[PDB]
């Protein structure tokens, strides 16, 4: 970690790269242990061949996850993260495309918005968008951080 | 796991109850090890110490995971979820209170909309609410889901 980040230094237009990394069979069932939510399609090898996606397929959550946590990787290595005080919330979250379990998706991250909030804070937007191996958007997203002003 | 529910099953004001859980540092380090993301405020005590929140805190994302998955409990135990057949989107989600680690946090889903799709599927969306042991919102959100209709 470097320096910190304050509300002021975050500009428009500046993009974080996180690093891929392949979704797993383990991936999953960390998942579902964890959400203790067994839906079928997901961890049922028969229920997934009737369905529409034929094999079983990454929860949307997990991908999500896994997305923003490779984004944050980055922030963390490279600046002093005191400044980011609270996650805002998730304005949109849209699954576009399935992942399966032997497909390597990789994340970006976008700087869209910037709000004043108070003296001491203001809130930033990012754009998230998840692409799997073959450059095929299969998840996007709207987040904000509150994160603090300068001293 | 008895019967299915379609499209027109689903009627707005039916709400879902899931069975509480506490929340624990086992949880939060779990969340943390599969999205490889070591946010300080989660995992490093010396680090909460100098925040807004003093103790360290769930990830937003744990939170979410864990309230969607009780949720889905409850439909998994009780209906054939094969008209269940995506997971739309999630159109808001806001984290209003911080959940410590040793809450006992409980959701709730309400359906709160129903679309047509097409022929064969509508979309519904549901509103989630997560409340801790002490009545509180922690975190409340916007999910909605494909369900196919009536044969």
Redesign the interface.
């Known amino acids: 970690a470097r320096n910190p980040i304050y509300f002021e230094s975050i500009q428009i237009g500046e993009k974080i790269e996180g690093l891929p990394?392949t979704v797993t069979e383990t991936?999953i069932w960390?998942?579902a242990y964890?959400?203790?939510?067994?839906?079928?399609?997901h961890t049922d090898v028969e229920?997934a061949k009737?369905?529409?996606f034929g094999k079983p397929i990454a929860?949307?959550?997990l991908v999500?996850?896994?997305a923003?946590?490779?984004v944050?990787?980055v922030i963390?290595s490279n600046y002093d993260?005191?400044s980011?005080?609270?996650?805002?919330?998730?304005?949109?979250?849209?699954?576009l495309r399935p992942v399966f379990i032997g497909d390597t998706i990789a994340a970006s991250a976008e700087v869209v918005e910037k709000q004043d909030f108070d003296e001491k804070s203001g809130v930033v937007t990012y754009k998230l968008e998840v692409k799997n191996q073959r450059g095929e958007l299969v998840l996007t997203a709207l987040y904000s951080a509150l994160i603090r002003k300068t001293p």
Chains 1, 2 share one sequence.
């Not at 964890?34 to 399609?41: K, Q, V």
């Not at 980011?84 to 699954?95: N, T």
Request: charged letters at 20%; a neutral charge.
């Open positions: 990394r991936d960390t998942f964890l959400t203790a939510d067994f839906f079928p399609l229920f009737k369905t529409i929860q949307g959550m999500l996850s896994i923003l946590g490779m944050d990787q963390l993260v005191s980011v005080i609270a996650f805002f919330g998730i304005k949109d979250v849209r699954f």
